[PDB]
């Protein structure tokens, strides 16, 4: 019944030293039934990454919508959108449906191409921005992720160390959530190279 | 309903209207809400008529049996019996009772027992749906150790206003005077009290 927990799923993002990381599980379900183990929840518009949890139809719909808006932004501005600007666009777009909202928990991650500064942000289903320095969590195992991130995280981690920390935060949180799991992906993001890794996890 | 009990120099006086309603229909316009539980211990009844009658009948039985064994009961004792019934059966009752009595030792005493079953000893008390409209008037005009005639006028004026504003109150004003001299019943008709 609760739209935010029908399909299940989680997203987490972290900052490091001159880098960011964003990760998600791959499950899509109909309550107890697992339907897909390839439902990726992370999208990118240029060098800006967006993770979305919640109702899968709205996840899909919002991706198509932000692709639409960022493609027009680029044609008019003659440049790719930055994370700080995109964050405001997400907030604007969500609040315009204040009384009929998308049931989602978006997460923005990226590096400003000009300043080189790492950036992450989280939102509620209505647009309130949570701009954190350390990490952002979203999904059905958000409580679990908060406990993992808050104890495992330390600032100024190097990309290859940050990978291990975010991966373990996701994996162990997902293993205490019935509605999350069935695979996982981690994006490691630097100013001009991005690596994507699929994790091996238990498939129950 | 509009009921009150007031202590004064020589004892205590109970007062009440005479209207009983079933919604907006006046089922009885000459009701006697001043009921005797002992020779010089009376009560004013408000709330469910069935409940308050049943209680007062039981109390009258208890005080009759008390008297047979231990002699004349105090007004405090009567109020305790009322309380014990109202408090222990609070889930199934809707009764707001004022108890008033005269001793020679304690003179005039007034106890009020609202819905919950708590007891409150007071110089004077007001209760019923019509009491709300005269809290200000009664507080401003009440004095301790009034005369009989002053106290009658105080109750008459007070209930006159309660009747004026409350639709659930009306009819005649009945009063019962409790002193060493005995027990006096009074009655005041609309043509008298409406022109006040």
């Amino acid at each position: 019944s609760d739209p935010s927990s029908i399909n299940g799923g989680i997203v987490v993002a972290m900052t490091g030293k001159d880098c960011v990381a964003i990760a998600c599980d791959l499950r899509l379900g109909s309550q107890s039934l697992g339907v897909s183990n390839k439902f990726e929840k992370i999208f990118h518009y240029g060098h800006v990454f967006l993770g979305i949890t919640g109702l899968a139809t709205d996840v899909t719909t919002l991706n198509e919508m932000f692709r639409y808006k960022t493609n027009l932004y680029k044609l008019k501005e003659e440049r790719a959108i930055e994370p700080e600007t995109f964050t405001q666009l997400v907030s604007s777009s969500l609040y315009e449906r204040r009384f009929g909202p998308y049931f989602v928990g978006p997460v923005v991650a990226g590096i400003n191409s000009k300043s080189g500064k790492p950036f992450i942000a989280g939102f509620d289903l209505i647009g309130c921005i949570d701009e954190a320095k350390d990490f952002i969590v979203s999904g059905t195992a958000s409580d679990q992720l908060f406990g993992m991130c808050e104890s495992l995280y330390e600032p100024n981690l190097e990309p290859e160390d940050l990978f291990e920390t975010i991966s373990q935060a996701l994996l162990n949180a997902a293993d205490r959530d019935a509605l999350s799991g069935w695979g996982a992906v981690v994006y490691i993001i630097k100013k001009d190279e991005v690596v994507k890794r699929y994790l091996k996890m238990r498939q129950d | 309903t509009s009921i009150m009990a007031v202590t004064f120099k020589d004892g205590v006086i109970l007062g009440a209207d005479s209207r009983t309603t079933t919604g907006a229909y006046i089922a009885n316009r000459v009701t006697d809400k001043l009921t005797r539980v002992h020779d010089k211990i009376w009560c004013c009844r408000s709330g469910s008529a069935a409940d308050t009658q049943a209680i007062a009948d039981i109390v009258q039985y208890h005080l009759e049996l008390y008297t047979s064994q231990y002699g004349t009961p105090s007004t405090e004792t009567a109020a305790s019996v009322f309380k014990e019934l109202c408090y222990e059966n609070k889930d199934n009752l809707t009764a707001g009772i004022i108890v008033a009595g005269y001793d020679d030792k304690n003179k005039g005493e007034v106890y009020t027992i609202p819905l919950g079953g708590s007891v409150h000893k007071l110089p004077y008390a007001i209760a019923g749906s019509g009491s709300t409209f005269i809290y200000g008037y009664c507080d401003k005009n009440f004095r301790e150790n009034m005369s009989k005639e002053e106290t009658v006028d105080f109750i008459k004026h007070s209930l006159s206003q309660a009747i004026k504003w409350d639709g659930s109150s009306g009819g005649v004003i009945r009063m019962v005077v409790l002193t060493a001299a005995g027990v006096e019943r009074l009655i005041f008709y609309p043509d008298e009290y409406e022109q006040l």
Binding site: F99, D124, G127, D130, D143, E164, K196, Y198, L199, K200 | -
Partner: protein, 226 residues
């Protein structure tokens, strides 16, 4: 949340805590509840977080356009009127409870405003879940003819009462001082009484601890030449 507003000699000061909640969970530990409507008109918000931000930005946008149209500096009564009429129209469904304060050519002002559209004037005000803890402090220590330094102290003390005693409030204290004939000074993290102690252990993992299936480079660049 805990937010307060205190008037003083030559101006007005507002303050707020920095905790944001999702039920019993803390979403943000260093949230910013002090919003700018105009340069010298600031408001603090409690209730639905998105609503306090959105309604503040909207009125702030319209106030800026108004200021440009009239060639005058914006007034607090204008922001107040625009806010209450907007909130009233939505019959409480926009859950914004605000303390609005500022200085303008008329003087210094302090108002509170509820989600249904009712406004209120005062020398000292408090809103949010910790408003009672804060108001207890304000009623104990407020006086007429406060100085700037006394008012900042009173305001932050009132927020601390909320931080310590209210579970819906916590972390740091933000302040904004609006004095007549001066620029408004926004004191982000004026107090920091809730720094986390050092952890007993480091949970940095050995590289290669996590099991991986596939790796791939992600093409973020545009389509290339040649």
């Amino acid at each position: 949340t805990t937010i307060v507003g205190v008037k003083f000699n030559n101006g007005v000061v507002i303050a707020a805590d920095t905790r944001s909640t999702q039920g019993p969970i803390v979403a943000d530990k260093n949230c910013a509840k002090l919003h700018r409507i105009s340069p010298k008109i600031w408001c603090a918000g409690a209730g639905t977080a998105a609503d306090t931000e959105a309604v503040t930005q909207l009125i702030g946008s319209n106030i800026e356009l108004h200021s440009l149209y009239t060639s005058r500096e914006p007034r607090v009564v204008s922001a107040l009127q625009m806010l209450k009429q907007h909130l009233f129209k939505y019959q409480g469904h926009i859950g914004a409870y605000l303390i609005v304060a500022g200085v303008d050519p008329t003087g210094s002002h302090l108002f509170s405003i509820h989600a249904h559209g009712s406004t209120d004037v005062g020398y000292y005000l408090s809103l949010g879940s910790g408003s009672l803890a804060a108001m207890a402090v304000l009623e104990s220590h407020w006086k007429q003819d406060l100085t700037k330094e006394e008012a900042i102290k009173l305001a932050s003390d009132a927020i601390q009462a909320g931080i310590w005693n209210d579970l819906g409030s916590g972390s740091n204290v933000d302040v904004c001082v609006m004095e007549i004939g001066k620029d408004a000074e926004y004191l982000r993290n004026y107090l920091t009484p809730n720094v986390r102690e050092e952890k007993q252990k480091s949970y940095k993992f050995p590289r290669g601890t996590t099991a991986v299936l596939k790796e791939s480079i992600v093409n973020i660049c545009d389509i290339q030449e040649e």
